[PDB]
Amino acid sequence: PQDLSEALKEATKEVHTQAENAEFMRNFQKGQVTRDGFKLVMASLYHIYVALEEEIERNKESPVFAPVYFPEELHRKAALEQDLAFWYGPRWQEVIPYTPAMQRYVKRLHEVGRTEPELLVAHAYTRYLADLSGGQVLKKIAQKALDLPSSGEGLAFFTFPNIASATKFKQLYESRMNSLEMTPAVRQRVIEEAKTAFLLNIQLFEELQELLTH
């Protein structure tokens, strides 16, 4: 539709299905997930969020992003640090992996926040609404499949403490996105960058699948 939030959903319908068919993702979707597979996903999320959040901070005051700037409600770096310390130990920062697919995703994030900030919204939208929408089912799948100790840590990433209602926050977020002022050219590029975002994820899964089954 005419609303960007609406245009984005319809346009990425295909890549979303593709992301779904991602072996690593479909397996996870079916419960087929191992500690090592999970650990790789968390390290992956950590590098992605460090880059994303780093770029969001860089453009927080820009009209092309300010409306969707939700630091308290959305930041994930801290939660992931808390999770990685659990999954990788006190020296997690020295052992977590940083694979080519992770780097490639990080690279496009920085390229966007630095040279194409008007498109950062596409990446924030893809990531945040992805993690906010399916986060619970995946977390749920995780604790049941991972059978982790009652340590009380490792899954903080999946809980957005500063968000009482995901559905309501989503409405607010979509409204903020639609409040953004952009020309048809930029809107087309943002739509296209959303797809690029899914593709980067899809290639990430593919890689983590090649790594896990080796």
Residues that bind ligand HEM (CB under 6 A): 8-9, 16, 19-20, 25-26, 29, 126, 129-130, 133-134, 198, 201
Give the distance from CA 48 to its chain's centroid. 7
CB of 4 to ligand HEM, least distance (A): 10
Q: CB-wise, 196 or 201, nearer to ligand HEM?
A: 201
CB of 151 to ligand HEM, least distance (A): 27
Segment (H or E) for 52: helix 35-59
Q: Which residue has the tokens 């984005």?
A: 8
CB of 20 to ligand HEM, least distance (A): 4
Q: CB-wise, 49 or 198, nearer to ligand HEM?
A: 198
Q: How many CB atoms lie within 10 A of CB 199?
A: 15
Alpha-carbon span 52 to 202, nearest angstrom = 17
- Using CB positions, name the residue nearest to ligand HEM: 130
Q: CB-wise, 52 or 156, nearer to ligand HEM?
A: 52
Question: Which distant-in-sequence residues (6+ apart) come within 8 Å of 87 by Cβ?
Answer: 35, 38, 39, 42, 154
